[PDB]
């Protein structure tokens, strides 16, 4: 179980320590007045309070930061990670899932530790093209950096400054060699890497199947379940297995689930006990 491998675990207490135990900025909590007003004349886009959607979360033992994208849902999708691709490895029919290695899917694991660091506010793609485009209309033309650009560089600094004290830890045992290390330090984006590849797609599936925990049933079933269905060769009975594991990994951590299976409200204690130590996660 690579998690728990020495690698694995200097790279949970550096993900936990550095970016994923603080707060979200409140410089990005809501945009200024200016981008305000020219956001609110575009009636067909979400409002600008997604901005600060999911800022925290009161629990019994402690506020928790970043509820929606903090270190129960990192290491959740890190241990989805080598149970999907035993899943497409039995079910897919595709060679490049049936041969991929256990390096490659301890190298994708591994990298998913690292697949939400950046973010400092909640938003999604698309509100964050909203802010670019209304501070472009509130400022005469002016750029702005895109949100998601931030984020991408606050993940490859934190990425990038780990990496490069461990690199006799790391190669060539689980990246073959600073090529290997370069091409996932580039590649590194939030949420996924966007990428068609075994490892891209495996990395994708694992951050989708986590969305239970925040779409509605309809929204997870039309956007996510019936690609899986399909990925999985077609068959409904090894895609409902794969979702009820993801279900399970949810509900074990106190986290809400939405999406799928059985729905159920956070629990808050339960929530905030592994929220606020990464060990309680692991351990379940």
Same mark, same amino acid.
């Given at each position: 179980?690579?998690?728990?491998?020495?690698?694995?675990?200097?790279?949970?207490?550096?993900?936990?320590?550095?970016?994923?135990?603080?707060?979200?900025?409140?410089?990005?909590?809501?945009?200024?007045?200016?981008?305000?007003?020219?956001? #609110?004349?575009?009636?067909?886009?979400?409002?600008?309070?997604?901005?600060?959607?999911?800022?925290?979360?009161?629990?019994?033992?402690?506020?928790?930061?970043?509820?929606?994208?903090?270190? &129960?849902?990192?290491?959740?999708?890190?241990?989805?990670?080598?149970?999907?691709?035993?899943?497409?490895?039995?079910?897919?029919?595709?060679?490049?899932?049936?041969?991929?290695?256990?390096? #490659?899917?301890?190298?994708?694991?591994?990298?998913?530790?690292?697949?939400?660091?950046?973010?400092?506010?909640?938003?999604?793609?698309?509100? &964050?093209?909203?802010?670019?485009? &209304?501070?472009?209309?509130?400022?005469?033309?002016?750029?702005?950096?895109?949100?998601?650009?931030?984020?991408?560089?606050?993940?490859?600094?934190?990425?990038?400054?780990?990496?490069?004290?461990?690199?006799?830890?790391?190669?060539?045992?689980?990246?073959?060699?600073?090529? #290997?290390?370069?091409?996932?330090?580039?590649?590194?984006?939030?949420?996924?890497?966007?990428?068609?590849?075994?490892?891209?797609?495996?990395?994708?599936?694992?951050?989708?199947?986590?969305?239970?925990?925040?779409?509605?049933?309809?929204?997870?079933?039309?956007?996510?379940?019936?690609?899986?269905?399909?990925?999985?060769?077609?068959? #409904?009975?090894?895609?409902?297995?794969?979702?009820?594991?993801?279900?399970?990994?949810?509900?074990?951590?106190?986290?809400?689930?939405?999406?799928?299976?059985?729905?159920?409200?956070?629990?808050?204690?339960?929530?905030?006990?592994?929220?606020?130590?990464?060990?309680?996660?692991?351990?379940?």
């Amino acid at each position: 179980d690579y998690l728990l491998s020495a690698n694995g675990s200097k790279a949970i207490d550096f993900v936990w320590s550095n970016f994923l135990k603080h707060p979200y900025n409140p410089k990005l909590k809501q945009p200024d007045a200016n981008v305000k007003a020219a956001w #609110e004349k575009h009636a067909d886009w979400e409002h600008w309070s997604n901005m600060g959607q999911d800022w925290s979360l009161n629990t019994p033992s402690g506020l928790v930061p970043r509820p929606n994208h903090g270190i &129960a849902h990192t290491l959740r999708v890190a241990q989805l990670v080598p149970v999907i691709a035993e899943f497409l490895k039995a079910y897919s029919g595709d060679p490049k899932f049936q041969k991929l290695t256990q390096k #490659e899917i301890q190298k994708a694991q591994y990298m998913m530790l690292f697949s939400v660091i950046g973010r400092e506010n909640d938003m999604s793609w698309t509100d &964050a093209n909203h802010y670019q485009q &209304a501070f472009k209309e509130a400022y005469n033309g002016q750029y702005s950096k895109h949100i998601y650009a931030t984020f991408k560089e606050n993940a490859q600094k934190g990425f990038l400054n780990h990496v490069v004290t461990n690199k006799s830890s790391l190669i060539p045992s689980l990246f073959s060699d600073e090529s #290997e290390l370069q091409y996932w330090a580039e590649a590194l984006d939030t949420g996924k890497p966007g990428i068609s590849s075994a490892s891209g797609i495996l990395m994708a599936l694992a951050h989708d199947l986590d969305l239970m925990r925040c779409y509605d049933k309809g929204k997870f079933n039309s956007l996510k379940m019936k690609d899986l269905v399909a990925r999985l060769g077609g068959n #409904e009975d090894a895609a409902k297995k794969l979702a009820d594991y993801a279900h399970d990994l949810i509900v074990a951590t106190g986290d809400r689930c939405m999406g799928y299976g059985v729905t159920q409200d956070y629990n808050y204690s339960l929530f905030g006990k592994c929220s606020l130590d990464p060990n309680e996660c692991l351990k379940l």
